[PDB]
Amino acid sequence: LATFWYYAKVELVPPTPAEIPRAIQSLKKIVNSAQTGSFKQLTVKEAVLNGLVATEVLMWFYVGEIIGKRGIIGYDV
């Protein structure tokens, strides 16, 4: 009912213009791990966790796609 918004205000919110530095910091951490090849230390549990949040953001891209074409089931045309 209303608890959905109660949680959304925390986690379903556009990122504030003040927190992008920490995000690009996480990005530079991940690309550093990619450069050195140290992702092999990541045990497959956390690797699967990261893959799942990646599929999460990919689903976000796809819901953006379906809201951008004004159609839910494929392309209306």
Partner: protein, 44 residues
């Protein structure tokens, strides 16, 4: 259950990919519409 603030990278990726999806959907809609109507007409 107490909520948890998602890491800023995940939120930025979320909303960025969302906006890119809106853009891609609009572009592909406008791109497919002409060829769509053209094939609909040429089928008859």
């Amino acid at each position: 259950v107490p909520p948890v603030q998602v890491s800023p990278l995940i939120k930025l990726g979320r909303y960025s990919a969302l906006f890119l999806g809106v853009a891609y959907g609009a572009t592909r809609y406008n791109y497919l519409k002409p060829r769509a109507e053209e094939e609909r007409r040429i089928a008859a």
